[PDB]
């Protein structure tokens, strides 16, 4: 295919995915369903007026003049009667209607005065606007805008724009509809279909467009389906006017009276290209992966199990560090990326900027532990490391960092997290509010979102504190009075009356909701779901072995639990999130550690491994390191440790 056709298809597909696609439907689509055309009615009017018709003399002006003369002379009732006689028929819908609706258009603007596009609209809810009083009484936010007066209210000639007089006074008669159509055209992406290049409506649209500036508006697309291939000069002239033309005759060979599959070729190509990621060379692979990964460079660590959400369920990212193909039908981009990583000879086949992008992606994937594919994986050895001062509990260093003067916004974020960890909830709340205040000028916005979430969590912690303090009964401390002066408490309550955590993510910009999709789970308990379920399952398996006295002789199933535990801990403690203070997280860590310790104790005293197999292999080992001691100390109570000691 031509490069420009590919670019147009890519832009249309991206706009459709973003939900900013609007379809401008013409009269050829209705003609495909063999609906009566206007020239037949003009012929009938000529026959009724003069007596005999003439095929040779029918110009563009005549098509509008003749019905006006008929209306002026014969009257009004004859016009309505003829319209009823010729237009009352009912016709079946067209496959093109279904193909149009299959592209998920935000709005459909049509100059047709029919019901086919309405009847074909399957199970989709569109608010039909065909008059003036219907603009204000719209029920939904999706408009089916019939510009030229549908026949819903009747078959009279006053409800439709047909004659020359109606065309002349169109702006005066329909200001609201014209303004709404112009706004929709100026905002969304417009794709014309079923229109001849010389049509009156397109000429009026281009005349209006010529008044605008040279940057403000996007270029609408135009699907042209005529028997003859387009000429070079005409294409250039119309592209200079603001239209980007996709010709259908150059996409498929056909005879001259062919119209259904001329439309169908382009429509099916557009529909199929939605799932088709246009990638053929390594440079496209690198560019696509960089585009989908780069927003996450702000976050220090990304847990592997969430990557499947980043890649829209295209690949299974397992905890051990392997990658598996799950639902991919394209050119296996991750496999090609791994092949490029393993061999340095092909690294010279990319341009300089793409080489640097590949280097950055390689560093990012190396940091997060993603190693290689599934079958190629060999002796993968994985270590654990957390680079947060809060996790290690080095309080003096955090205090010194708080005293030291900050130079950026990330230092303020870390200082707020350390202040919250140190119990200074008032100062931490104030500093979080300051961060939200000063984050107006940004480039990503993740800091703003995380700061708002942290502030809300600190609000909850303060409220629950106040509650327990006053409720407990001043037994601890003298009067048990927190540093929460009633003025401070009051201010907090006033500032957080209407804050709704459920709609926080929905109110963020579109780019944020498209790039940082994984962060959506941070506002509720969903981010602990995918782990918890798994844990339960594994428990019901592991104990099922311990009852039967079965000793495995390979890789145990506790590795999954340990790796998911450490991934969650690292992700929460390295991005400075307050969710580490929740009760649910503590319970999850407690259950994981208890299961690991029980399994280790069961495997410690085997029966026949030494007597026999031990000559071949003996891998049974659970070493309690520093991190295990820290987790057991922090997330366990005395009763739980006593139960573990008893067992």
């Amino acid at each position: 295919l031509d490069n420009n056709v590919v670019e147009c298809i890519k832009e249309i597909t991206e706009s459709s995915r973003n939900g900013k696609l609007v379809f401008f439907v013409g009269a050829g689509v209705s003609t495909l369903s063999d609906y009566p055309q206007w020239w037949r009615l003009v012929d009938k009017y000529h026959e009724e007026l003069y007596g005999s018709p003439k095929k040779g003399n029918y110009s563009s002006d005549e098509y509008l003049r003749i019905p006006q003369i008929f209306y002026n002379v014969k009257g009004e009732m004859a016009f309505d009667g003829i319209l009823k006689d010729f237009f009352q028929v009912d016709k079946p819908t067209n496959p093109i209607h279904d193909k149009i609706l299959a592209m998920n258009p935000a709005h459909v603007i049509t100059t047709n005065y029919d019901n086919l596009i309405d009847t074909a609209c399957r199970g989709k809810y569109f608010s039909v606007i065909s008059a003036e009083e219907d603009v204000a009484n719209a029920t939904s936010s999706r408009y089916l805008l019939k510009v030229h007066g549908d026949f819903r209210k009747g078959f009279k000639g006053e409800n439709v724009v047909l004659k020359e007089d109606d065309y002349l006074n169109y702006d005066q008669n329909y200001p609201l509809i014209s303004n709404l159509m112009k706004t929709i055209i100026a905002t969304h992406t417009i794709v014309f279909i079923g229109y001849g290049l010389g049509d009156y409506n397109i000429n009026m649209l281009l005349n209006w467009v010529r008044k605008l500036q040279k940057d403000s508006f996007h270029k609408p697309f135009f699907i042209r389906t005529d028997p003859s291939p387009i000429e070079n000069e005409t294409l250039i002239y119309y592209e200079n006017k603001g239209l980007r033309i996709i010709d259908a005759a150059s996409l498929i060979d056909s005879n001259e009276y062919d119209y259904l599959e001329r439309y169908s070729a382009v429509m099916d190509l557009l529909i199929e290209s939605q799932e088709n990621k246009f990638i053929t060379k390594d440079d496209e692979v690198i560019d696509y992966i960089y585009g989908k990964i780069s927003p996450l460079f702000a976050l220090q660590y990304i847990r592997k199990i969430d990557l499947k959400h980043v890649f829209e369920y295209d690949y299974h990212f397992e905890v051990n560090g392997t990658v598996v193909r799950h639902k991919n039908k394209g050119f296996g981009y991750m496999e090609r990326f791994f092949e490029l990583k393993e061999s340095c000879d092909e690294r010279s086949k990319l341009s300089k900027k793409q080489y640097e992008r590949f280097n950055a992606l390689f560093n990012f994937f190396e940091k997060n532990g993603v190693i290689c594919m599934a079958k190629d994986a060999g002796t993968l050895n994985t270590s654990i490391e957390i680079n947060s001062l809060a996790y290690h509990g080095k309080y003096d260093v955090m205090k010194k960092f708080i005293e030291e003067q900050s130079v950026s916004i990330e230092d303020d974020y870390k200082k707020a997290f350390f202040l919250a960890c140190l119990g200074r909830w008032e100062e931490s709340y104030d500093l979080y509010s300051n961060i939200i205040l000063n984050s107006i000028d940004e480039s990503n916005g993740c800091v703003y979102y995380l700061s708002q979430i942290n502030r809300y969590r600190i609000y909850q912690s303060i409220t629950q504190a106040v509650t327990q303090f006053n409720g407990l009964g001043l037994l601890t401390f003298g009067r048990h009075y927190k540093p929460f002066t009633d003025e401070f408490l009051a201010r907090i309550e006033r500032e957080m009356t209407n804050f709704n955590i459920d709609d926080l993510f929905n109110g963020m910009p579109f780019e944020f909701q498209k790039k940082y999709k994984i962060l959506e789970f941070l506002s509720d308990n969903q981010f602990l779901y995918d782990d918890t379920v798994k844990l339960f399952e594994l428990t019901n398996k592991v104990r099922s072995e311990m009852s039967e006295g079965s000793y495995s002789f390979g890789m145990s199933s506790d590795i999954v639990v340990l790796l998911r535990l450490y991934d969650n801990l690292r992700f929460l403690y390295e991005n400075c999130l307050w969710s580490v203070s929740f009760h649910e997280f503590h319970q999850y860590i407690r259950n994981s550690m208890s299961l690991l310790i029980e399994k280790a104790e069961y495997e410690r005293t085997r029966d026949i491994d030494e007597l026999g197999f031990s000559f071949f292999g003996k891998k049974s080992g659970f070493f309690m390191e520093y991190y295990d001691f820290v987790n057991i100390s922090r997330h366990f109570k005395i009763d739980d440790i006593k139960n573990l000691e008893r067992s």
């Binding site: 006295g549 000793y551 002789f553 890789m555 026949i608 026999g612 197999f613 071949f616």
Partner: protein, 111 residues
């Protein structure tokens, strides 16, 4: 190939998915057969008290009628996963254990 090996200590057996090319005593030759052991301590019995596990021999997917079980010619062990030779591991594991049948394919717990 050893990753799927399992030890069942309730009956002192090994679960391994392998095929046995056993040669029955007195020149009788058998193709890739295997064994299945079932553990049942509550079965109603008469004079055959000396049993808690019942051992069946499956050949070509059909149960072999036992007439005189004295096969001690070992077997060319074939790991049906990707056709490995694991005969030496089998002969070692067998000498290490005093049980009659040291390796089976599937164990059913009827407890």
């Amino acid at each position: 190939a050893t990753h799927d090996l399992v030890y069942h200590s309730k009956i002192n057996t090994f679960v391994w998915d392998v095929e046995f090319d056993i040669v029955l005593s007195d020149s009788k030759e058998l193709n890739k057969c295997y064994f299945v052991k079932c553990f049942n301590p509550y079965r109603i019995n008469g004079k055959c008290d000396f049993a808690v596990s019942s051992i069946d021999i499956f050949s070509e997917g059909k149960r072999l009628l036992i007439e005189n079980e004295f096969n001690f010619k070992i077997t060319k062990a074939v790991h049906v996963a990707t056709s490995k030779d694991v005969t030496e591991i089998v002969l070692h594991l067998s000498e290490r254990i005093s049980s009659p049948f040291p390796i089976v394919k599937e164990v059913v717990y009827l407890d």
